[PDB]
Design an enzyme around this catalytic site. Structure first.
Site, short mmCIF file in Angstrom:
data_model
loop_
_atom_site.label_atom_id
_atom_site.label_comp_id
_atom_site.label_asym_id
_atom_site.label_seq_id
_atom_site.Cartn_x
_atom_site.Cartn_y
_atom_site.Cartn_z
N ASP A 184 20.66 0.66 28.90
CA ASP A 184 20.09 1.40 27.76
C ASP A 184 20.63 0.73 26.49
N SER A 234 16.65 3.94 9.87
CA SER A 234 16.70 2.47 10.12
C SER A 234 18.14 1.95 10.07
N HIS A 278 12.65 -7.60 -1.15
CA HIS A 278 12.37 -8.93 -0.56
C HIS A 278 12.89 -8.95 0.87
N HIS A 313 11.83 -13.02 -7.97
CA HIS A 313 10.43 -13.50 -8.00
C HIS A 313 9.45 -12.33 -8.11
N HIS A 314 9.92 -11.08 -7.99
CA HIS A 314 9.11 -9.87 -8.28
C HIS A 314 9.21 -9.50 -9.75
N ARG A 367 -3.88 -5.20 -10.62
CA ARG A 367 -3.49 -4.28 -9.54
C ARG A 367 -3.51 -2.83 -10.08
C1 HEA Z 1 5.32 -9.67 5.69
C2 HEA Z 1 5.35 -9.60 4.41
C3 HEA Z 1 5.62 -10.73 3.51
C4 HEA Z 1 6.09 -12.03 3.81
C5 HEA Z 1 6.60 -12.58 5.07
C6 HEA Z 1 6.08 -12.69 2.48
C7 HEA Z 1 6.50 -14.06 2.35
C8 HEA Z 1 6.55 -14.80 1.13
N1 HEA Z 1 6.19 -14.28 -0.06
FE1 HEA Z 1 5.51 -12.39 -0.48
N2 HEA Z 1 4.97 -10.44 -0.87
C9 HEA Z 1 4.77 -9.45 -0.02
C10 HEA Z 1 4.91 -9.56 1.41
C11 HEA Z 1 5.37 -10.74 2.09
N3 HEA Z 1 5.63 -11.93 1.49
C12 HEA Z 1 4.47 -8.19 -0.65
C13 HEA Z 1 4.24 -6.86 -0.04
C14 HEA Z 1 4.42 -8.48 -2.03
C15 HEA Z 1 4.11 -7.59 -3.19
C16 HEA Z 1 5.22 -6.65 -3.45
C17 HEA Z 1 4.66 -5.66 -4.52
O1 HEA Z 1 4.65 -5.99 -5.75
O2 HEA Z 1 4.14 -4.58 -4.10
C18 HEA Z 1 4.73 -9.93 -2.05
C19 HEA Z 1 4.87 -10.57 -3.30
C20 HEA Z 1 5.39 -11.89 -3.46
C21 HEA Z 1 5.75 -12.46 -4.79
C22 HEA Z 1 5.71 -11.84 -6.14
C23 HEA Z 1 4.37 -12.12 -6.78
C24 HEA Z 1 4.15 -11.20 -8.00
O3 HEA Z 1 4.28 -9.92 -7.84
O4 HEA Z 1 3.78 -11.75 -9.09
C25 HEA Z 1 6.18 -13.80 -4.50
C26 HEA Z 1 6.74 -14.73 -5.52
O5 HEA Z 1 7.28 -15.77 -5.15
C27 HEA Z 1 6.08 -13.91 -3.01
C28 HEA Z 1 6.31 -15.13 -2.28
C29 HEA Z 1 6.45 -15.24 -0.89
C30 HEA Z 1 6.87 -16.52 -0.27
C31 HEA Z 1 7.23 -17.83 -0.93
C32 HEA Z 1 7.00 -16.19 1.10
C33 HEA Z 1 7.42 -17.12 2.20
O6 HEA Z 1 8.30 -16.39 3.06
C34 HEA Z 1 6.18 -17.72 2.88
C35 HEA Z 1 6.60 -18.91 3.72
C36 HEA Z 1 5.53 -19.43 4.65
C37 HEA Z 1 4.84 -20.58 4.48
C38 HEA Z 1 5.01 -21.45 3.31
C39 HEA Z 1 3.78 -20.95 5.49
C40 HEA Z 1 4.23 -21.71 6.75
C41 HEA Z 1 4.87 -23.00 6.41
C42 HEA Z 1 4.35 -24.22 6.73
C43 HEA Z 1 3.09 -24.46 7.51
C44 HEA Z 1 5.20 -25.43 6.33
C45 HEA Z 1 4.67 -26.25 5.22
C46 HEA Z 1 4.60 -25.56 3.88
C47 HEA Z 1 4.83 -26.11 2.67
C48 HEA Z 1 5.22 -27.55 2.45
C49 HEA Z 1 4.60 -25.28 1.43
N4 HEA Z 1 5.45 -12.81 -2.39
C1 HEA Z 2 1.80 -3.21 6.53
C2 HEA Z 2 1.40 -3.16 5.29
C3 HEA Z 2 -0.03 -3.07 4.94
C4 HEA Z 2 -1.23 -3.06 5.73
C5 HEA Z 2 -1.45 -3.29 7.17
C6 HEA Z 2 -2.30 -2.88 4.71
C7 HEA Z 2 -3.68 -2.80 5.08
C8 HEA Z 2 -4.84 -2.64 4.25
N1 HEA Z 2 -4.70 -2.55 2.91
FE1 HEA Z 2 -3.00 -2.47 1.78
N2 HEA Z 2 -1.28 -2.41 0.68
C9 HEA Z 2 -0.06 -2.55 1.09
C10 HEA Z 2 0.33 -2.71 2.46
C11 HEA Z 2 -0.53 -2.80 3.57
N3 HEA Z 2 -1.87 -2.69 3.44
C12 HEA Z 2 0.97 -2.49 0.04
C13 HEA Z 2 2.41 -2.62 0.18
C14 HEA Z 2 0.20 -2.33 -1.18
C15 HEA Z 2 0.68 -2.24 -2.58
C16 HEA Z 2 0.84 -0.75 -2.96
C17 HEA Z 2 1.15 -0.65 -4.48
O1 HEA Z 2 0.48 -1.32 -5.33
O2 HEA Z 2 2.13 0.12 -4.86
C18 HEA Z 2 -1.16 -2.32 -0.65
C19 HEA Z 2 -2.23 -2.22 -1.57
C20 HEA Z 2 -3.61 -2.35 -1.21
C21 HEA Z 2 -4.68 -2.57 -2.19
C22 HEA Z 2 -4.51 -2.74 -3.64
C23 HEA Z 2 -4.64 -1.41 -4.40
C24 HEA Z 2 -4.58 -1.57 -5.92
O3 HEA Z 2 -3.88 -2.53 -6.40
O4 HEA Z 2 -5.20 -0.73 -6.64
C25 HEA Z 2 -5.90 -2.61 -1.38
C26 HEA Z 2 -7.25 -2.89 -1.91
O5 HEA Z 2 -8.17 -3.14 -1.19
C27 HEA Z 2 -5.48 -2.44 0.02
C28 HEA Z 2 -6.34 -2.35 1.14
C29 HEA Z 2 -5.94 -2.44 2.50
C30 HEA Z 2 -6.97 -2.48 3.55
C31 HEA Z 2 -8.43 -2.33 3.32
C32 HEA Z 2 -6.23 -2.61 4.74
C33 HEA Z 2 -6.79 -2.72 6.06
O6 HEA Z 2 -6.59 -4.08 6.48
C34 HEA Z 2 -6.16 -1.76 6.99
C35 HEA Z 2 -6.90 -1.80 8.36
C36 HEA Z 2 -6.25 -1.12 9.50
C37 HEA Z 2 -5.27 -1.61 10.23
C38 HEA Z 2 -4.72 -2.94 9.94
C39 HEA Z 2 -4.76 -0.84 11.45
C40 HEA Z 2 -3.48 -0.29 11.25
C41 HEA Z 2 -3.06 0.46 12.49
C42 HEA Z 2 -2.34 0.02 13.52
C43 HEA Z 2 -1.87 -1.42 13.60
C44 HEA Z 2 -2.01 1.04 14.60
C45 HEA Z 2 -2.01 0.35 15.93
C46 HEA Z 2 -1.89 1.28 17.11
C47 HEA Z 2 -1.16 0.91 18.19
C48 HEA Z 2 -0.44 -0.43 18.26
C49 HEA Z 2 -1.09 1.84 19.35
N4 HEA Z 2 -4.07 -2.19 0.13
O1 LIG Z 3 8.30 -10.10 -0.97
O2 LIG Z 3 7.62 -11.58 -0.81
CU LIG Z 4 9.81 -11.12 -2.41
#
Ligand code: HEA
Ligand code: HEA
Ligand SMILES: [O-][O-]
Ligand SMILES: [Cu+2]
Ligand SMILES: CCCCCCCCCCCCCCCCCC(=O)OC[C@H](COP(=O)([O-])OCC(O)COP(=O)([O-])OC[C@@H](COC(=O)CCCCCCCCCCCCCCCCC)OC(=O)CCCCCCCCCCCCCCCCC)OC(=O)CCCCCCCCCCCCCCCCC
Ligand SMILES: CCCCCCCCCCCCCCCCCC(=O)OC[C@H](COP(=O)([O-])OCC(O)COP(=O)([O-])OC[C@@H](COC(=O)CCCCCCCCCCCCCCCCC)OC(=O)CCCCCCCCCCCCCCCCC)OC(=O)CCCCCCCCCCCCCCCCC
Ligand SMILES: CCCCC/C=C/C/C=C/C/C=C/C/C=C\CCCC(=O)O[C@H](COC(=O)CCCCCCCCCCCCCCCCC)COP(=O)(O)OCCN
Ligand SMILES: CCCCC/C=C\C/C=C/C/C=C\C/C=C\CCCC(=O)O[C@H](COC(=O)CCCCCCCCCCCCCCCCC)COP(=O)(O)OCCN
Ligand SMILES: CCCCCC/C=C\CCCCCCCCCC(=O)O[C@H](COC(=O)CCCCCCCCCCCCCCC)COP(=O)(O)OC[C@@H](O)CO
Ligand SMILES: CCCCCCCCCCO[C@@H]1O[C@H](CO)[C@@H](O[C@H]2O[C@H](CO)[C@@H](O)[C@H](O)[C@H]2O)[C@H](O)[C@H]1O
Ligand SMILES: CCCCCCCCCCO[C@@H]1O[C@H](CO)[C@@H](O[C@H]2O[C@H](CO)[C@@H](O)[C@H](O)[C@H]2O)[C@H](O)[C@H]1O
Ligand SMILES: CCCCCCCCCCO[C@@H]1O[C@H](CO)[C@@H](O[C@H]2O[C@H](CO)[C@@H](O)[C@H](O)[C@H]2O)[C@H](O)[C@H]1O
Ligand SMILES: C[C@H](CCC(=O)O)[C@H]1CC[C@H]2[C@@H]3[C@H](O)C[C@@H]4C[C@H](O)CC[C@]4(C)[C@H]3C[C@H](O)[C@]12C
Ligand SMILES: CCCCCCCCCCCCCCCCCCCC
Ligand code: CUA
Ligand SMILES: [Mg+2]
Ligand code: NA
Lengths: 513, 258, 56, 227, 44, 72, 75, 75, 72
Positions: free
Chosen positions: A91, A157, A240, A290-291, A438
């Site tokens: 467990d 969590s 982040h 970066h936010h 937004r």
């Molecule tokens: C699962 C969620 C998730 C993940 C994993 C990431 C991953 C990353 N995010 Fe993002 N991000 C969000 C969810 C996520 N983000 C959310 C929710 C917001 C908005 C928050 C809010 O305001 O509500 C946001 C906003 C956000 C901002 C702020 C933008 C703004 O508000 O103006 C920035 C700025 O740098 C950022 C950057 C990145 C980068 C650099 C990564 C990196 O980790 C990505 C790295 C991956 C790759 C690059 C691809 C694979 C790589 C390769 C194939 C190799 C080769 C690539 C190169 C040579 C470039 N994201």
């Molecule tokens: C996990 C995070 C997540 C996911 C999945 C989504 C999914 C979707 N989101 Fe959103 N969204 C956010 C996180 C997410 N979002 C966040 C963080 C913001 C910013 C809020 C803010 O500005 O403060 C945002 C904001 C945001 C905006 C911007 C609003 C605005 O700026 O005014 C819009 C606009 O179209 C949007 C649309 C949608 C739509 C159409 C989907 C669709 O793709 C959803 C479709 C349905 C699914 C993907 C299924 C989900 C269910 C399961 C997976 C259950 C599975 C069951 C079993 C496994 C048994 N979301």
């Molecule tokens: O948070 O990218």
């Molecule tokens: Cu970030």
């Protein structure tokens, strides 16, 4: 018996089951919220009301998708079911504390739904910035109920993270080093470390917001010498890491699914994959501002946050290329889980790359608080985290249930969801570049075509969600019982049968040195 | 079973704990906005009942039933370390708030720290006494630990009693300083940082003193062996954490911030 | 005081099928019922309070 | 302003916005190429019945996988940071204008010489004059001299707002108790539009920004007439 | 406790039509809730 | 050993507490409260407190804590 | 005088302290000049800079606080 | 004016910074008054205080350094 | 174990050094030397140095280290 089993559980599998049910229900709430968003934006004008009702919906959409759907499913559900089985443990370390992590979530969810029912709701954004979230611009109980919702999900969590770290460190077979544990187990341990360190800082920040709202503190209020930008630093110091928490377990599930349906005994470059996840976890603590590229920070600070953020592409790239190298030479099985995982690799890459565009402070001036950000994060969340959840769900449903899905239906489900999420989010890039902000209930007329198409996409995704419920029903309705599972020699979680007995590993595995 | 780990009996305390959290939060909401303490007092009562019965059951499982093998004890060690780390990061947020406000005092403050109209406590008076008290308690709890390892019941009890007496002394001194302070929680960011940071610390001192009192009664009841006494180690670790947070508060808020 | 741990070890290891939270005897059942009654009653009251606060 | 079916950035009105367009073109080429290469490699891995399922050595290939991305990031960072420092460079403005965000309108203050201030509210949809843009016109535009370096200072008297003009490359958060600075220089006369870019309550969607860029002599007479 | 397929879950799968009703109510209530919350906010 | 940590407890730690207790004892006694000035960054009231008349802090001391309108 | 020049003491996006410092400098200079009965015109540079940079509501609030006796800066 | 009064900024046996500050204050004030062409009588308090407190050799060294362009304080 | 410490050496420590090396080699260009001012608190000479002409510091750089009388 039923109460003892399902309300008083000390069993990792049953608690995992409770998390998956909770997360599934939460996903239906978050889906409904997403459709209200897209209904409001699907034609120019006002459908529901002004920005307050609209932003209550947007705020609740985010909290539900993040805190009640993704984290419970990935960590509480897959983590509780699979981690003990993958290390041959009987467990979790703290099986009773584990049950309290679960039971804190219904109350957390109740407080969020209470926030939306009282007064005019918390129309703050999921970031809950003051002074909009303060006691003048959001008078009354809504924001306090949101803060308390976050406190209970936070405790859930934090205790869950203590449980996973302890279990993964302390309860492996004595011959098994940390470098002989599966990648999913690594992904959960690293996620748990991020939660342990990040959530307490969120707790401190939202507690300061609570005291500014109710005890006449002024942490964020300039009249008292406070600073609204301090809240932003504390929030994003958590926020982040939180996005790495949302994707890391998805990375772990993707490694297992790609390995499995490639017919491989192991992922390509195991130690590289461990290195990449630890690197991403560490770098994820030193990039938060970066936010905040538009808040007025100094140029050298902007230069540092740009550079540090871009560095994350290196370890992330090693994982993407290692998944491709795992496919290389595989006997590929085109299962529904493999389709989810291949969609993940591609669509996660696209969202990661738009994240690298945003990492550039100078360009972020024009992209910040626009739909370009919305496009980036829905590629990584709604096509990354969600594709990993759907892949993991269809891959492990027969382990959990003892029943098979209809693979044809599951492939139909994948195809519909793939079309809908791309139709929804691809056009939001155009809306972002061209300047659509937004958190808008309505837009200048020029933005109509892409908003129309995006809303039509959201309806296709709704059809996929409805079909998914039918597909789960059909599996339980038909009762096709699992017989043989391939590759048990490198997938220990399957070796006790489907479903495994309530007690597994009462006699531990034999592993010699 | 032929492993060393503890399969826990099905338990109601996780659910009562979760519900006590709902009642405390909904209770605080009802107190702040609807002028009523009823939900909050029900939640605090159920929270105390839950803690009592849960930790009672942990004593039953260990002292009375023998489930705490070395492997189980090692897990509890990691759990308590991880819990302490999470509490460190919680305090880090308050220290960040303090340094943010004090290193760049805004015009509303007079552009200085301490703010115009703020008369800080003298760090060489009660704050220094409080420092001596918590450091002294760090010494006495170490004496208590060595006494227990050496099998000395009387000296363990005397050292642990001294440790608790100092924790109580600190709490009473802090209560009196709160009452005497010419500034309040509503005196801008100075009062905000001072009372919320020292207030959470005071709460941790009360929690830690309660834990030490639990160890004191368990010791009176002979629960601890010279080699097996994890509740005492955990209380001692928590107590060092409380001391170290105080030293950071003293240097940051009381001394550097004066 | 005298060391009565052996007598508590016998009580808590007695082969009576009770879970550890009830194994001390009738007092455990009472304190369990008080706890669960306050939790469930308190939760129902919190729902009534939401109903009330949901309207002006 | 944006136009229907627009895919990219609004046309640049300022030199820095011109710089951002060329930097975005360079970055987008890289994003296109990497996305394309990943999709192509997926399709290559999945289109052969040939197999190799024994253990594969990782270290040689991991050099390529880390070095090539490191080089690509440097090729983004160099121009990125050149533009960052170019916007920050000292320029000597001719004029300072303040804007204060409010729920839900902008006020402007031109106090270099006289006490000129006014409020700028969205034109309601029902009061638009024929040819005017829904949600974008204001009663009182921000008249400014073209071809001149202007210092804009941004704050709020209530909640957060953000003062944005995409075609000039501008977005500065409006924070109560804080005075944020940016510089504005229009290469052209005309009308340049933006929208509040921080969630600020019920009418966040409905407090836009309209700059009116005219010759200095017109700006001077307008200023005098607005006292 | 019951072990095996259809027994390691807090809901019955003994009757597929009773299960359809329970699943309908479960997922349906989650999906409905936001529409009824919006209705509630609009009716104040 | 226990012997050494007891030696430190009684020989160093408690003597320190005794000396700091002396030091505090000698510097106690009420110092004279400052002239009330209604500074806007102090005596903050954005929401009434949830106890008493809403205008008194939780450990309000009439001697040294003025209300927004001054000393009681 | 067109507008306030670049000031190397305040080179960053946050210009709050620039407004504040110039407001303080003007009022300190004005007090020093009214006291010895000297000329407030020597203070003119500080006056032009704070009027250029400072929001009207900040100046208005600060002036009200100097008259009330609640201004927290040293003049 | 008899002699420099007690100054709560400099309450200790080390009066070095009292001499330095009044010397800077005098010369900053004299530069501001010469600068708009205003009147140096405004600066008289600072002149009397530094002349009272400062060793003649310190004043003479500082004066020489101001004329040389090597005075390290900001005037 | 050695394995872990090797993993940290190559996976964290040397990558850090490589990035600081890159950071440093990007800001390695010679800065503009500042006007000479014969400040009395700098270029101290109370006794001649025990090498060269007595007036040059040990790691004297003609480009950036002026003598008491100015740049060479
Ligand atoms: C699962 C969620 C998730 C993940 C994993 C990431 C991953 C990353 N995010 Fe993002 N991000 C969000 C969810 C996520 N983000 C959310 C929710 C917001 C908005 C928050 C809010 O305001 O509500 C946001 C906003 C956000 C901002 C702020 C933008 C703004 O508000 O103006 C920035 C700025 O740098 C950022 C950057 C990145 C980068 C650099 C990564 C990196 O980790 C990505 C790295 C991956 C790759 C690059 C691809 C694979 C790589 C390769 C194939 C190799 C080769 C690539 C190169 C040579 C470039 N994201
Ligand atoms: C996990 C995070 C997540 C996911 C999945 C989504 C999914 C979707 N989101 Fe959103 N969204 C956010 C996180 C997410 N979002 C966040 C963080 C913001 C910013 C809020 C803010 O500005 O403060 C945002 C904001 C945001 C905006 C911007 C609003 C605005 O700026 O005014 C819009 C606009 O179209 C949007 C649309 C949608 C739509 C159409 C989907 C669709 O793709 C959803 C479709 C349905 C699914 C993907 C299924 C989900 C269910 C399961 C997976 C259950 C599975 C069951 C079993 C496994 C048994 N979301
Ligand atoms: O948070 O990218
Ligand atoms: Cu970030
Ligand atoms: C399943 C899916 C269901 C449906 C999904 C929704 C469909 C959307 C329809 C798009 C068509 C647009 C249109 O009207 O095209 C006419 C349009 C008219 O051309 P134009 O007016 O000369 O525009 C050229 C621009 O000036 C070019 O300059 P710009 O400055 O105007 O360009 C910027 C613009 C330009 O970008 C685009 O044109 C996007 C093309 C997408 C490729 C697919 O936007 C972007 O940066 C988009 C960011 C995308 C993020 C990264 C995407 C990764 C690519 C994946 C690789 C796979 C390839 C195999 O023709 C096109 O370019 C086709 C698009
Ligand atoms: C904001 C709130 C947050 C909401 C979050 C919701 C999510 C919560 C997750 C936890 C689920 C609940 C389970 C524990 C407690 C439930 C108690 C209860 O009554 O349950 C009856 C019910 C099943 O009834 P059954 O079929 O009659 O019982 C079979 C027993 O074996 C036979 O047992 P018995 O014969 O001894 O006694 C059974 C009997 C009585 O059992 C007892 O003695 C229980 C007495 C105390 C129960 C306290 C628990 C309350 C639930 C907590 C959450 C609130 O149950 C009944 O038939 C009547 C109960 C009626 C109450 C219904 C409450 C269910 C959940 C509510 C959903 C959301 C409501 C919000 C409304 C929103 C409107 C705005 O349990 C469930 O609700 C289970 C979920 C419903 C079916 C969904 C299936 C979906 C499949 C998705 C696939 C994902 C999994 C993949 C892996 C699968 C293989 C491992
Ligand atoms: C590269 C990494 C670091 C290298 C370290 C030093 C290298 C050479 C000297 C070795 C000994 C160092 C020990 C510390 C002593 C004093 C000075 C050393 C620091 C140094 O090297 O400083 C140099 C001056 O050296 C000078 O004067 C002359 C220095 C030589 C004479 C020193 C004589 C004094 C010896 C004192 C011994 C006391 C021992 C104590 C014993 C204690 C026992 C109880 C700096 O060069 P600069 O041109 O002024 O400025 C640079 C301008 N471009
Ligand atoms: C001797 C020290 C011991 C402390 C005990 C005192 C009071 C009760 C509870 C304490 C808990 C600690 C911190 C909570 C915040 C504020 C209290 C700060 C400490 C304190 O007690 O501050 C007092 C104000 O109390 C006030 O407002 C009191 C307000 C009472 C209600 C508190 C609200 C609870 C906040 C919620 C906590 C959230 C927890 C987060 C958990 C994290 C989950 C992830 C100071 O008195 P004053 O008259 O202003 O000035 C003195 C003038 N002579
Ligand atoms: C007015 C204030 C109200 C607020 C609420 C909190 C108030 C008080 C809480 C005080 C904490 C008391 C904890 C008592 C734990 C007793 C059980 C115990 O100590 O159990 C021990 C195991 O440790 C274990 O579980 C270790 C378990 C450790 C838990 C300690 C955690 C501190 C908890 C803080 C909780 C709230 C903090 C949040 C603040 C924001 C049992 O093993 P041994 O000791 O080896 O014995 C066995 C030998 O006899 C064999 O020979
Ligand atoms: C085991 C369960 C069975 C018992 C159930 C519990 C019964 C408790 C009901 C009493 O309700 C209380 O009434 C007080 C007065 O009516 C309130 O004080 C309120 O009013 C006071 C004075 O009227 C003020 O001083 C306080 O600030 C204020 O919170 C108090 O909050 C509230 O809780
Ligand atoms: C195990 C089961 C759990 C127990 C559940 C107990 C539920 C019964 C509690 C009694 O309800 C009370 O009603 C009072 C009405 O008389 C309220 O008084 C408060 O509200 C009053 C309403 O006017 C005001 O006078 C004051 O704020 C204050 O006295 C108070 O809020 C509330 O507690
Ligand atoms: C970007 C994705 C492309 C995937 C590239 C994967 C390359 C894998 C090479 C490692 O496999 C090798 O193949 C050789 C036989 O050919 C073996 O002899 C050798 O021992 C083995 O290590
Ligand atoms: C007589 C009794 C014996 C305990 C035993 O061996 O059962 C002794 C041993 C140590 C004693 C305690 C410690 O000496 C410390 C405390 C000293 C105070 O003077 C009385 C209370 C005080 C808390 C004591 C109570 C009681 O007399 C104890 C508990
Ligand atoms: C079990 C620990 C393995 C150490 C691997 C180190 C390489 C990753 C470096 C990134 C940061 C790690 C922080 C710890
Ligand atoms: Cu103002 Cu959004
Ligand atoms: Mg913003
Ligand atoms: Na709309």
């Amino acid at each position: 018996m039923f109460i003892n089993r399902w309300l008083f559980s000390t069993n990792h599998k049953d608690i995992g089951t409770l998390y998956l049910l909770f997360g599934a229900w939460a996903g239906m709430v978050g889906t409904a919220l997403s459709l209200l968003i897209r209904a409001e934006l699907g034609q120019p004008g006002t459908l529901l009301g002004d920005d307050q009702i609209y932003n209550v919906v947007v705020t609740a959409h985010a909290f539900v998708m993040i805190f009640f759907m993704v984290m419970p499913i990935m960590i509480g559900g897959f983590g509780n079911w699979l981690v003990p089985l993958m290390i041959g443990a009987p467990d979790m370390a703290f099986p009773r504390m584990n049950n309290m992590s679960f039971w804190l979530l219904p109350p957390s969810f109740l407080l969020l739904l209470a926030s939306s029912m009282v007064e005019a709701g918390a129309g703050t954004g999921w970031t809950v910035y003051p002074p909009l979230a303060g006691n003048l611009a959001h008078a009354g109980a809504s924001v306090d109920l949101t803060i308390f919702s976050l406190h209970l999900a936070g405790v859930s969590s934090i205790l869950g993270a203590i449980n996973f770290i302890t279990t993964i460190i302390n309860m492996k077979p004595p011959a098994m080093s940390q470098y002989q544990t599966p990648l999913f187990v690594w992904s959960v341990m690293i996620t748990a470390v991020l939660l342990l360190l990040s959530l307490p800082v969120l707790a401190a920040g939202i507690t300061m917001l609570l005291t500014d709202r109710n005890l006449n503190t002024t942490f964020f209020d300039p009249a008292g010498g406070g600073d609204p930008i301090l809240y932003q630093h504390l929030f994003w110091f958590f926020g982040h890491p939180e996005v790495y928490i949302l994707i890391l377990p998805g990375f772990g599930m993707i490694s297992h699914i790609v390995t499995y349906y490639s017919g491989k005994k192991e992922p390509f470059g195991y130690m590289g994959m461990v290195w990449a996840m630890m690197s991403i976890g560490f770098l994820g603590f030193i990039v938060w501002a970066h936010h905040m590229f538009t808040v007025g920070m100094d140029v050298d600070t902007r230069a540092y946050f740009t550079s540090a953020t871009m560095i994350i592409a290196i370890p992330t790239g090693v994982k993407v290329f290692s998944w491709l190298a795992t496919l290389h030479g595989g006997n590929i099985k085109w299962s529904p889980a493999m389709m989810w995982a291949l969609g993940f690799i591609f669509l996660f890459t696209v969202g990661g790359l738009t994240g690298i565009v945003l990492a550039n402070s100078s360009l972020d001036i024009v992209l910040h608080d626009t739909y370009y950000v919305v496009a980036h994060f829905h590629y990584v969340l709604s096509m990354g985290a969600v594709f990993a959840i759907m892949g993991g769900f269809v891959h492990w449903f027969p382990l959990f249930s003892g029943y098979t899905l209809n693979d044809t239906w599951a492939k139909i489900h994948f195809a519909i969801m793939f079309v809908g999420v791309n139709m929804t989010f691809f056009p939001q890039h155009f809306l972002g570049l061209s300047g659509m902000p937004r958190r808008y209930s309505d837009y200048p007329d020029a933005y109509t075509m892409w908003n129309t198409i995006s809303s039509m996409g959201s309806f296709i995704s709704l059809t996929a969600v409805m079909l998914m419920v039918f597909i789960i029903w059909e599996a339980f309705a038909s009762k096709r019982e699992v017989l043989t599972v391939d590759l048990t020699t490198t997938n220990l979680e399957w070796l006790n049968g489907c479903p495994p007995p309530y007690h597994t590993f009462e006699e531990p595995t034999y592993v010699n040195l | 079973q032929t492993h060393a780990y503890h399969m826990v009996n099905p338990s109601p305390w996780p659910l009562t704990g979760a519900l006590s959290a709902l009642l405390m939060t909904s209770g605080l909401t009802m107190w702040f906005h609807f002028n009523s303490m009823t939900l909050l007092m029900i939640g605090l009562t159920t929270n105390m009942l839950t803690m009592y019965q849960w930790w009672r059951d942990v004593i039953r499982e260990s002292t009375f039933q023998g489930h705490h093998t070395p492997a189980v004890q090692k897990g509890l060690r990691y759990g308590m370390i991880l819990f302490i780390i999470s509490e460190v990061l919680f305090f880090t947020g308050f220290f960040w708030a303090f340094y943010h406000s004090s290193l760049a005092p805004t015009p509303e403050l007079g552009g200085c720290w301490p703010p115009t109209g703020i008369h800080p406590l003298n760090p060489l008076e009660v704050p220094l006494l409080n420092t001596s008290v918590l450091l002294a308690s760090g010494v006495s709890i170490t004496w208590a630990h060595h006494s227990l390892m050496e099998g000395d019941r009387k000296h363990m009890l005397q050292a642990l009693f001294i440790t608790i007496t100092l924790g109580v002394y600190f709490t009473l001194l802090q209560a009196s300083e709160y009452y005497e302070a010419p500034f309040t929680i509503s005196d801008g960011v100075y009062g905000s940082t001072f009372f919320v940071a020292t207030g959470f610390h005071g709460l941790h001192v009360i929690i830690g003193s309660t834990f030490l009192i639990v160890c004191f009664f368990r010791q009176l009841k002979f629960h601890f062996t010279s080699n097996h006494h994890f509740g005492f180690e955990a209380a001692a670790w928590y107590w060092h954490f409380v001391d170290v947070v105080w030293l950071f508060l003293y240097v940051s808020i009381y001394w550097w911030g004066s | 005081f005298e060391n009565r741990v052996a007598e508590k070890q016998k009580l808590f290891q007695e082969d009576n099928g009770l879970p550890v939270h009830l194994k001390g005897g009738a007092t455990d059942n009472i304190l369990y019922r008080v706890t669960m009654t306050l939790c469930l009653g308190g939760t129902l009251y919190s729902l009534y309070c939401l109903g009330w606060a949901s309207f002006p | 302003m944006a136009y229907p079916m627009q895919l990219g950035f609004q046309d640049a009105t300022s030199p820095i916005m011109e710089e951002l367009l060329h930097f975005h073109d360079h970055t987008l080429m890289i994003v296109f190429l990497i996305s394309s290469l990943v999709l192509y490699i997926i399709s290559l891995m999945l289109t052969t019945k040939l197999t190799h399922t024994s253990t594969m050595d990782a270290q040689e290939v991991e050099t390529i996988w880390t070095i090539l991305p490191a080089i690509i990031l440097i090729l983004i960072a160099l121009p990125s940071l050149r533009i960052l420092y170019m916007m920050d460079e000292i320029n000597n403005p001719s004029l300072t204008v303040k804007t204060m965000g409010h729920q839900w309108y902008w006020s402007y203050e031109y106090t270099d010489y006289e006490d000129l201030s006014f409020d700028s509210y969205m034109i309601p949809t029902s009061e638009l004059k024929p040819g005017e843009l829904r949600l974008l016109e204001v009663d009182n535009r921000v008249v400014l001299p073209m071809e001149m370096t202007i210092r804009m200072l941004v704050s709020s008297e209530d909640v957060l707002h953000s003062w944005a003009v995409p075609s000039l490359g501008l977005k500065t958060d409006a924070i109560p108790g804080r005075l944020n600075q940016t510089t504005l220089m229009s290469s052209r006369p005309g009308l340049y539009y933006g929208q509040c870019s921080e969630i600020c309550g019920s009418n966040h969607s409905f407090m836009p920004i309209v700059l009116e860029l005219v010759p200095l002599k017109y700006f001077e007479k307008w200023s005098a007439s607005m006292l | 406790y019951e072990e095996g397929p259809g027994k390691n879950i807090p809901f019955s799968v003994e009757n597929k039509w009773r299960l359809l009703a329970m699943m309908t109510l479960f997922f349906g209530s989650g999906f409905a809730a936001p529409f009824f919350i919006v209705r509630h906010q609009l009716l104040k | 050993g226990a012997r050494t940590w007891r030696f430190l407890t009684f020989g160093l730690a408690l003597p320190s507490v005794a000396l700091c207790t002396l030091n505090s004892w000698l510097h106690s006694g009420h110092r004279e409260r400052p002239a009330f000035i209604p500074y806007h960054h102090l005596r903050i009231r954005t929401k009434p407190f949830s106890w008493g008349d809403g205008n008194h802090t939780f450990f309000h001391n009439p001697r040294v804590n003025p209300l927004p309108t001054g000393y009681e | 005088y067109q507008t306030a020049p670049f000031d190397s003491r305040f080179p960053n996006q946050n210009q709050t302290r620039n407004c504040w410092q110039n407001y303080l400098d003007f009022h300190r200079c004005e007090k020093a000049m009214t006291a010895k009965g000297g000329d407030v015109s020597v203070c003119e540079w500080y006056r032009r800079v704070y009027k250029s940079l400072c929001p009207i509501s900040w100046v208005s609030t600060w002036d009200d606080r100097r008259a009330e006796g609640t201004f927290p800066g040293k003049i």
